[PDB]
Ligand SMILES: *[C@@H]1O[C@H](CO)[C@@H](O[C@@H]2O[C@H](CO)[C@@H](O[C@@H]3O[C@H](CO)[C@@H](O)[C@H](O)[C@@H]3O)[C@H](O)[C@H]2NC(C)=O)[C@H](O)[C@H]1NC(C)=O
Ligand SMILES: *[C@@H]1O[C@H](CO)[C@@H](O[C@@H]2O[C@H](CO)[C@@H](O[C@@H]3O[C@H](CO)[C@@H](O)[C@H](O)[C@@H]3O)[C@H](O)[C@H]2NC(C)=O)[C@H](O)[C@H]1NC(C)=O
């Protein structure tokens with residue numbers, strides 16, 4: 102009477118510690134009941150490998166916790182998928198990327214940054230890159246023990262000290278006296294739940310402006326940088342415009358637009374704050390996207406720096422009509438609507454096996470016997486993916 | 497009988513210390529002898545400020561040495577120009593940027609680097625951004641002083657340790673024994689000729705791989721990194737990308753051809769060498785420009801980071817005919833021929849005064865009274881500019 106459809110799809114990304122283990126649910130409905138088959142990135146199918154992979158009731162695939170000696174790449178680093186099929190057809194769920202991370206020691210360091218008196222200084226906590234995605238900066242702590250980043254999910258921007266949403270610590274108006282203060286960043290492993298203070302203690306090395314200098318970027322000997330950053334909706338972006346000069350310069354921010362060589366000034370309102378040489382955007386919407394330009398000027402000259410912004414939006418899919426009934430030889434239309442950002446590509450599948458059709462909507466001239474089954478619109482960007490399905494019957 | 501011309505013109509950038517002082521000289525020929533004035537590109541002419549500037553016996557501009565206190569911004573950091581004048585017309589030299597920097601104290605540091613065993617590690621000597629224009633890495637060395645290598649002195653690419661043109665220290669396939677050793681850099685301020693050792697010592701902190709890891713960037717996110725570099729012709733550039741993973745990934749360097757995104761593989765000849773994940777080009781040329789790419793695939797997955805190179809050639813220009821003799825009413829013009837790279841803009845001037853024409857041909861539909869005089873074609877870009885002079889005479 103009805104084909105298979107996923108009631109609950111597995112999530113895009115599952116990251117878990119060897120100590121933690123993991124569980125992934127897949128359930129689809131229809132009649133007569135669909136099977137539930139776990140499938141690898143390519144094809145074939147999923148077996149149980151005791152102590153590592155098991156399938157429980159409800160059709161849930163579980164990875165129990167394991168000791169480091171038992172780690173296997175083809176198991177733990179693999180990208181999986183769920184398959185549900187009945188007599189009417191088959192449907193594959195969205196791609197499920199599984200990465201297990203065996204618990205290991207690591208140390209976080211806050212290195213010093215060099216700055217001229219006044220202006221603004223910014224200190225970053227240096228986190229090993231390979232662990233970088235599993236660890237986030239929570240707060241910062243000075244010699245007297247003050248927590249600058251520990252209050253609220255949003256920080257007051259009008260004070261001397263501000264902990265940026267990027268985890269980085271921003272300081273307005275560096276004085277000669279504050280150089281005697283040292284700071285430590287606290288990090289927390291999202292899986293283990295362990296918190297640890299930074300190993301080394303960072304400090305500000307302050308150079309006295311005994312002579313004037315143009316704006317100087319972080320690069321050396323003709324080195325510029327274009328930082329392309331992405332942040333999800335409702336989150337908070339931070340745009341960096343690192344510089345040092347004397348006399349202390351002023352930072353004017355601008356925004357390019359689609360296919361333009363020009364720009365316009367940026368709105369400074371309560372939604373989007375600016376602080377010194379750094380711009381913060383709270384409650385990021387999708388329209389905050391597009392090429393941004395920071396320009397630093399003073400009496401002796403000026404320079405600009407480019408940073409581009411793309412706001413991630415959750416992908417989705419809907420096929421219409423969900424269930425279609427068409428005669429023999431008569432065409433039928435499946436249009437796939439979707440919501441999200443960005444979208445790199447869109448695929449199509451018939452009964453679990455993929456077609457080469459790259460367009461959002463697809464057509465069929467004359468309905469034949471082979472044209473009955475389950476179809477799916479696969480929309481995937483580089484970082485994610487999502488899908489829906491539809492049924493077609495003959496009459 | 498003849499108009500003004502420069503047989504000697506200053507170089508664009510002149511940098512010097514408070515103790516060193518500096519001189520810049522122009523000279524002019526023609527007939528009768530054109531008078532030589534030193535005028536700010538700001539539009540005003542400068543005279544003799546005692547001890548902080550003056551003019552010597554012949555035509556030249558000299559900045560004497562001075563103690564730190566006597567530093568004045570309006571003199572020591574300024575754009576200047578050289579101007580020749582006679583009854584025929586006027587001409588100006590290229591914009592000369594004079595930058596004086598008083599001797600002061602600074603320190604460099606070598607921060608620790610985090611690396612997965614088997615991967616190549618790159619240690620950086622961190623120097624203040626504002627002294628970056630001057631100081632450059634000379635050599636590295638052991639805890640006891642043993643040199644790992646000296647920058648700019650000869651080479652070889654196949655050894656464990658190699659110091660790159662950028663000044664960084666590269667280590668191939670880091671291992672357990674390396675963790676016990678310290679890496680320590682010496683730098684040289686080229687204006688003061690003084691070399692000092694970094695205040696701190698960097699140490700390699702090695703993590704032992706257990707589970708597999710996709711290729712990881714130096715950024716966490718959400719912030720990948722573009723790098724815009726560039727280098728002088730027949731210099732030595734260095735490309736880069738900071739991949740950290742297990743198992744050790746392989747690096748295939750490609751190059752975006754002109755225009756469209758079509759990729760092309762990079763050749764490794766006796767000149768161009770690739771060690772681990774870092775490409776090098778010795779004796780660079782302008783044709784080496786264009787967007788580059790290094791794709792790092794791994795057993796688990798793959799990722800790509802981009803860099804765009806531009807190699808500069810010295811700027812010059814020549815205007816023909818050197819001197820036109822135009823009859824009354826006939827269109828007569830100078831075309832601007834030149835060589836160099838890059839060129840962002842080109843402008844013109846009528847006997848010292850700016851018009852605002854753009855493309856390098858000036859054509860007027862016919863001559864008049866005022867048209868008689870001097871003309872110049874000024875090619876300009878970020879780092880420098882050059883010029884040429886020409887005349888017409890009504891008849
Ligand atoms: C996930 O993997 C980690 C590996 O880092 C497991 O933690 C490790 O557990 C072993 C025990 O099997 C610890 O080794 C022990 O160390 C003590 C000295 O502290 C020694 O006396 C014992 O004989 C034994 O060798 C190891 O230190 C520990 N490492 C860390 C970083 O915690 C963890 O148990 C695994 N999760 C599981 C099995 O659920
Ligand atoms: C603040 O400083 C920036 C320097 O980064 C200034 O931007 C620069 O402005 C100059 C003119 O003021 C531009 O020069 C012009 O360029 C066009 C080509 O686009 C050329 O045809 C003109 O003849 C002229 O030379 C320069 O391109 C521009 N550079 C950048 C990177 O923006 C900015 O104007 C300064 N703002 C203020 C208010 O002074």
Ligand SMILES: *[C@@H]1O[C@H](CO)[C@@H](O[C@@H]2O[C@H](CO)[C@@H](O[C@@H]3O[C@H](CO)[C@@H](O)[C@H](O)[C@@H]3O)[C@H](O)[C@H]2NC(C)=O)[C@H](O)[C@H]1NC(C)=O
Pocket residue numbers: 514515516561562563564598599600601
């Ligand atoms: C350019 O500026 C520098 C820095 O201001 C000048 O060098 C400095 O000279 C002073 C001497 O007036 C040095 O101070 C000290 O002198 C006492 C003796 O009274 C001595 O015991 C100390 O050991 C120290 O030398 C200062 O160290 C020195 N600093 C540097 C960086 O060189 C320099 O003289 C100026 N150039 C000219 C041409 O005057």
Ligand SMILES: *[C@@H]1O[C@H](CO)[C@@H](O[C@@H]2O[C@H](CO)[C@@H](O)[C@H](O)[C@H]2NC(C)=O)[C@H](O)[C@H]1NC(C)=O
Pocket residue numbers: 791792793794797798799800
């Ligand atoms: C190396 O890594 C890349 C990822 O950057 C793999 O996938 C390519 O990804 C781009 C999108 O950035 C696609 O346009 C390409 O079509 C992908 N490659 C292919 C072959 O389809 C790439 O496949 C990896 N290569 C190897 C040999 O593993």
